[PDB]
Amino acid sequence: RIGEVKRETKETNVSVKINLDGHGVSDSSTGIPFLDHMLDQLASHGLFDVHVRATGDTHIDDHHTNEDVALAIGTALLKALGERKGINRFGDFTAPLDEALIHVSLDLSGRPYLGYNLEIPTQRVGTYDTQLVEHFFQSLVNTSGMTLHIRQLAGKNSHHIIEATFKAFARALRQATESDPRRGG
Amino acid sequence: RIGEVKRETKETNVSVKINLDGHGVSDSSTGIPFLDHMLDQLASHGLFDVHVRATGDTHIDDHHTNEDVALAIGTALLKALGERKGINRFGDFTAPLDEALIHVSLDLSGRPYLGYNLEIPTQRVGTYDTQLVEHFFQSLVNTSGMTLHIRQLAGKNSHHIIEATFKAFARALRQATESDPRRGG
Amino acid sequence: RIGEVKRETKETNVSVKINLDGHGVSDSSTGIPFLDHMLDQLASHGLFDVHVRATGDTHIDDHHTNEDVALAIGTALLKALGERKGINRFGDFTAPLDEALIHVSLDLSGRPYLGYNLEIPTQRVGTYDTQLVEHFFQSLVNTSGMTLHIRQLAGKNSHHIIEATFKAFARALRQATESDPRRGG
Amino acid sequence: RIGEVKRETKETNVSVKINLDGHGVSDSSTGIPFLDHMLDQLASHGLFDVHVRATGDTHIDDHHTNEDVALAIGTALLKALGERKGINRFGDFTAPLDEALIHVSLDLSGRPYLGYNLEIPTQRVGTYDTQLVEHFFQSLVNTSGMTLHIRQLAGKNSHHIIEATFKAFARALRQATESDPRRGG
Amino acid sequence: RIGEVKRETKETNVSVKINLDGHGVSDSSTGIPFLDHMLDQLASHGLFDVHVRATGDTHIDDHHTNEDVALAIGTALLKALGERKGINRFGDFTAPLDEALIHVSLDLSGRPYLGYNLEIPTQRVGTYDTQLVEHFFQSLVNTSGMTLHIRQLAGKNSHHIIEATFKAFARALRQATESDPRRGG
Amino acid sequence: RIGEVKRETKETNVSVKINLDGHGVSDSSTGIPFLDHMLDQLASHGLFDVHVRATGDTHIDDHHTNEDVALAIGTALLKALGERKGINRFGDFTAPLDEALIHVSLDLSGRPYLGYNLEIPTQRVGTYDTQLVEHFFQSLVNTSGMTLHIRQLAGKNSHHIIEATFKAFARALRQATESDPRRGG
Ligand SMILES: O=P(O)(O)C[C@H](O)Cn1cncn1
Ligand SMILES: O=P(O)(O)C[C@H](O)Cn1cncn1
Ligand SMILES: O=P(O)(O)C[C@H](O)Cn1cncn1
Ligand SMILES: O=P(O)(O)C[C@H](O)Cn1cncn1
Ligand SMILES: O=P(O)(O)C[C@H](O)Cn1cncn1
Ligand SMILES: O=P(O)(O)C[C@H](O)Cn1cncn1
Ligand SMILES: [Mn+2]
Ligand SMILES: [Mn+2]
Ligand SMILES: [Mn+2]
Ligand SMILES: [Mn+2]
Ligand SMILES: [Mn+2]
Ligand SMILES: [Mn+2]
Ligand SMILES: [Mn+2]
Ligand SMILES: [Mn+2]
Ligand SMILES: [Mn+2]
Ligand SMILES: [Mn+2]
Ligand SMILES: [Mn+2]
Ligand SMILES: [Mn+2]
């Protein structure tokens, strides 16, 4: 079960491929290094094999090369799934880091939606603009065709809240499409 | 594992049977057609085989023929279970529709309770009186002997909130009694 | 410039075709008659030729046969456009009815968004559920791939506010894609 | 998989052993009888085999013999686990009693934390000082090395809230370390 | 219709030329790269041919080399126009990006004014100081001799609000001076 | 009295050694230079001999290489102490910088706790993320096994508040364990 999408514009050049049924292998180098620590989380905890290579204009702000990565993961994930048959289709999970809880629920059925209730106190994490985290999941929703609710329940630390939502999105994505129920189709 | 209850009063005539271990088959025609769309949800997502035939006085308000359907599903579900042995007994699940989250938790152990926190903005959905949804689960609780907490977390659409709680009740009922733990009894 | 989409599920059967460059001709019969008065407005004021034939389950609530009409207009409108070249791409317009102003702005470039600020006082217009008007434009946005801002500026009348936003959406859709600028491509 | 810890000070004398992979057997007599009803819950619902023998100074307040029990369960649970390999590592669960919901989430990875949001109305349950329940889980966190979030969602009954958090901690501890994912190590 | 202004002080060295009647060609390299992405917008959407070469002291803050660019565009734009005859003279436009609306209105008649109602949440975009955007249009107003009202109507994203006002200023500047009415002079 | 801890993970490589009874000598180079100015303060004012060598991934945010330094100082400090005998065990001190008072109290007896009441106005000091100062003392508490209360009493300057708490922690750590009372053991 693999979907691979290449996509190149005048701003970015994005190469994306995902094995949906796989192991904790990860090779994914974007132009900004903080996404590389977050795409490790949906490889080791979601047990996906994700491969991202993106070259973009970080000479200017990082908004352009974060859209085109997140848009390409969704088109690869819509192409990874087929005619949706024999999957659980519902993924819900909550995951603590230190002091912080995120609850992530998702639907993976045609219709795109993003509910976003996180509030990050600081404006940069290391060098990541921190207003792009909602824009990562907004771009992932619009091409994958999924409903997604992300809710913060506790916690005040910028590196801890963003890493609690990428562990909880990974565990709730391998519960929806990766696992299978008792029915056949 | 089947329980079947017939029940007839001067107002209604209700025939109800449930296969608790079954597939996504559904034949259930009540006097009001909007329940028929909701009992489809606890057949396809709960993987139950539910059979409801009710004839009642919809010449007057629909309050009378909604009690006697919901009372008969519970007596059939108490008769579907036996001496409760080797079941998980706890069912919790949250399920998104577009913009709306419902969290449903349940207990299935003797004691009846209903906590209800939904707030529906409109007063009719198509023709369904919308004040009967809490009364559906109040009648189902009192005969099944279960604790039930239903909590709205987001969402403003009458057809979306009621369909998000009948998908989440179904997935949380096939987690409590249908699945079995590692112990035998 | 024509796009035609047929779409049939277990609930509805929808046939939709749009001439984007056309005249004020209109033949469009949905299962609910109040949409037929509103699709007249995007034919005579938008100068589109829209043809809708939908058969659906109005035996239950009208939510199901309003999605599948609005989803099919968008896929027809994405197929009416091609590689977007030589269009204005921006459509903004405000249109009064009696006492009521709606301001509609749109983008037609890939990314879907809906901003909705209307507040209708009553719950039915004639028989139309009135909570579906936002759901009409939510379904039209997700398949057409357009940003859409709809803002109420004045007015308290249910038939006047909904008819002021379907005149202003029509005039702002024939300004974006139908008219052409001085450039060639 | 067994860890056994003996620990004796001038105040208490505590003997603690836990089979982490086991059945619903329970023999655990502390000096105060209300802990004995609560350690039954993490034996039958968590499917652990816990053995506690503690003799302490209940001639004075029960604060001293509740620390040393809860400190010894954690050191036994850190010794029950080894090099943490091939476990789910995340345990989240919510469990109703009558009218009361507790949501318990946990992490079991090195770092200790306790978030506590319960509010018990009365000051004694039978004879248990009721300000020690947070101190039970504070002592269990500091030696086990786990993050733990405990959140009350409803309910006003002292015996019902404390028994809803010891059923939900047990089900969320046999989900984190007891169950195993599809990966090997 | 071309105006070209060279201007050099002890701090900056600015070379600016604008073809007002032209096409979507753009070669404009300032010392800070985020202006280069914004001056692309008034070339492709305004259909102007703008040429900016500025060398300045970005060894210190960027306030000095943003004034002298914006002051030189206005003197070039006052020299691009002549005795104002046969132009529309009024330019108003609103332009959505994702979630954000800016309404820009302008006058181009002698008298300088700037109304500014934007509120940007963050303090840097990539490396641009974000308090200079109002100072860009304040310097452009004082030399061009135009009234300018900029009003935010929605939106919370720093890169989206600033790019929605440079698309709407461009479309409202090619409506005022570039297009011509039915009168001759 | 020396404890030395080496610790290496996939992210960092930390070498830490502390002479608890020593002089004002300091050689400690972490990957981020602002910790090096703060570990000078617990060498000259605490009269400790601390040696830290850490190599970590400052290619991404500094959160990872600040945990593993602070975790290694605590394990070295627990190994510096032995069976705690003949020490004062209580350390309390308040220390002014310009306009700012911090009161630091500590316990060094088994049980870990951190109370943190500082509020820093800015978000970076030079390049240090400033949300990590509480996370420094949270990691130092969990491995050393000490209670620690840090309270701000006055002051508004980011470099002055953080340097007032590292002078007051040093003087309160050489009062607890370094000095000895009149008793022998
Ligand atoms: O969760 P872990 O312990 O497996 C490693 C984390 O990814 C690193 N971390 C520590 N604090 C925040 N992130
Ligand atoms: O959830 P689906 O997409 O399987 C079909 C829904 O039952 C129909 N629906 C669409 N909006 C509200 N209900
Ligand atoms: O706008 P008109 O006058 O062309 C006809 C309207 O469509 C009918 N109407 C009158 N009030 C509300 N709608
Ligand atoms: O939950 P049960 O019914 O298995 C027995 C309970 O432990 C006893 N109880 C009844 N109310 C509060 N506790
Ligand atoms: O508006 P577009 O899609 O033509 C390209 C934008 O300029 C890039 N962008 C995407 N988000 C914010 N800016
Ligand atoms: O406290 P001092 O004067 O010994 C030197 C300080 O460490 C340097 N300093 C001056 N302001 C803030 N820090
Ligand atoms: Mn964007
Ligand atoms: Mn991390
Ligand atoms: Mn009743
Ligand atoms: Mn439905
Ligand atoms: Mn819908
Ligand atoms: Mn009308
Ligand atoms: Mn205590
Ligand atoms: Mn009890
Ligand atoms: Mn200035
Ligand atoms: Mn841009
Ligand atoms: Mn951390
Ligand atoms: Mn200093």
Quickly list DSSP for A25-91.
Answer: -EEEE-SSHHHHHHHTHHHHTS--EEEEEEE--TTS-TTHHHHHHHHHHHHHHHHHS-S--S----E
Instruction: Count CB neighbours of E61 within 10 A.
Output: 11
3-state secondary structure chain D: CEEEEEEECCCCEEEEEEECCCCCCEEEECCCHHHHHHHCHHHHCCCCEEEEEEECCCCCCCCHHHHHHHHHHHHHHHHHCCCCCCCCCCEEEEEECCCCEEEEEECCCCCCEEEECCCCCCCCCCCCCCCCHHHHHHHHHHHHCCEEEEEEEECCCHHHHHHHHHHHHHHHHHHHHHCCCCCCC
Ligand 7 centroid distance, CA of C46 (Å)? 29
Interface of A with D (CB under 8 A): 23-24, 47, 93-99, 101, 153-154, 167, 171
Q: Which residues pair with A102 in a beta bridge?
A: A95, A152
Q: Which residue has the tokens 């085109």?
A: A68
Residues 6+ apart with CB under 8 A from B112: B141, B142, B144, B145, B146, B147
Backbone angles phi, psi at C54, to 5 degrees: -130, 130
> Which residue, by CA, sits nearest to atom 3 of ligand 6?
F97
Tokens of B110: 């003797």
Tokens of D168: 């939900």
How far is the CA of B91 from the CAs of B103, B144, B146, D163, F62, in angstroms? 11, 15, 11, 17, 42
The reply, when asked if residue A135 is annotated as ligand binding, is yes
Class of residue F124 by CB neighbours under 10 A (exposed 0-12, middle 13-18, buried 19+): middle
Whether D96 and B111 lie within 8 Å, measured CB to CB = no
CA quadruple A181, A182, B3, B6: dihedral, nearest 10: 60
Give the residue numbers of the binding site of F: 11, 37-45, 63-67, 89, 111, 135, 159-167
- Mutating to test ligand 2, I would choose from A87, A109, A146, A147 the residue with most ligand atoms within 8 A of its C-beta, which is A109
Q: Which residue has the tokens 């909550």?
A: A94
D150-167 residues labelled b (16+ CB within 10 A) or e (exposed): bbbbbbebbbebbbbbbb
Instruction: Count CB neighbours of C135 within 10 A.
Output: 20
CA–CA dist E181, E87 (Å, integer): 6
Crossing angle for the helix pair E133-144 and E64-80, nearest 10 degrees? 30
Nearest alpha-carbon partner for E89 in E182, E184, E185, E178: E178
CA quadruple C65, C67, C73, C76: dihedral, nearest 10: -100
CA-based angle A151:A156:A162, to the nearest 5?
Answer: 55
> Do residues A151 and A81 make contact, with C-beta atoms less than 8 angstroms apart?
no
F18-37 residues labelled b (16+ CB within 10 A) or e (exposed): bbbebeeebebebbbebbee
Q: Which residue has the tokens 């003949």?
A: F86
Resolution of the structure, angstroms: 3.1
CA–CA dist B3, B80 (Å, integer): 4
Report which DSSP code applies to E77.
H
C88-102 residues labelled b (16+ CB within 10 A) or e (exposed): ebbbbbbbebeebbb
Rounded to a whole number, what is the distance in Å from the CA of B170 to chain C's nearest CA?
Answer: 21
CA–CA dist C108, C113 (Å, integer): 10
The reply, when asked if residue A159 is annotated as ligand binding, is yes
Does the domain formed by E1-88 have CATH 3.30.230.40?
Answer: yes
Report which DSSP code applies to C166.
H
Per the entry, the structure determination technique was cryo-EM
CA-based angle F22:F25:F31, to the nearest 5?
Answer: 125
Backbone angles phi, psi at B15, to 5 degrees: -125, 120
Q: Show me where chain F is broken: residue before each gap, C-N > 2.5 A.
A: none
Q: Are the folds of A1-88 and A89-185 the same?
A: yes
How far is the CA of D70 from the CAs of B61, E130, F59, F108, F145, in angstroms? 58, 54, 42, 20, 16
The reply, when asked if residue A51 is annotated as ligand binding, is no
Give the residue numbers of the binding site of B for substrate: 11, 37-45, 63-67, 89, 111, 159-167
Phi-psi region of B87 (alpha: psi -120 to 50; beta: other; left: phi over 0): beta
Tokens of E139: 């310097």
CA–CA dist C37, C166 (Å, integer): 10
> Do residues C70 and C112 make contact, with C-beta atoms less than 8 angstroms apart?
no
CA-based angle A149:A152:A157, to the nearest 5?
Answer: 135
Whether B158 and C131 lie within 8 Å, measured CB to CB = yes
What architecture does CATH give domain B89-185?
A: 2-Layer Sandwich (3.30)
CA-based angle F3:F9:F15, to the nearest 5?
Answer: 30
CA F37 to ligand 6: nearest atom: 7
How far is the CA of F138 from the CAs of B179, F76, F134, in angstroms? 42, 16, 6
Class of residue D7 by CB neighbours under 10 A (exposed 0-12, middle 13-18, buried 19+): middle
Q: Which residues pair with C7 in a beta bridge?
A: C14
CA–CA dist D23, D2 (Å, integer): 13
Rounded to a whole number, what is the distance in Å from the CA of A9 to chain C's nearest CA?
Answer: 14
Which residues have CB under 6 Å of ligand 3? C 159-160, 163
> Which residue, by CA, sits nearest to atom 10 of ligand 6?
F160
CA quadruple D88, D91, D96, D101: dihedral, nearest 10: -160
Nearest to B94 among A105, A111, A183 (CB): A105
Q: For chain F, what's the residue count?
A: 185
CA–CA dist E15, E34 (Å, integer): 18
Domain locations in chain E as residue ranges:
1-88, 89-185
Q: C-chain residues within 8 Å CB-CB of E94?
A: 92, 105
Class of residue C166 by CB neighbours under 10 A (exposed 0-12, middle 13-18, buried 19+): buried
Nearest alpha-carbon partner for C48 in C73, C24, C29: C24
- C-beta F37 within 6 A of ligand 6: no
Probe site for chain A from F9, F32, F61 (most A CB atoms < 10 A): F61
Give the chain E residue whose CA is nearest to the CA of A122: E122
CA–CA dist D56, D70 (Å, integer): 13
CA–CA dist E26, E49 (Å, integer): 6
Whether B106 and D93 lie within 8 Å, measured CB to CB = no
Nearest to B147 among D96, D153, D171 (CB): D96
Q: Which residue has the tokens 């490790």?
A: A40
Rounded to a whole number, what is the distance in Å from the CA of B84 to chain A's nearest CA?
Answer: 22
Whether D115 and A24 lie within 8 Å, measured CB to CB = no
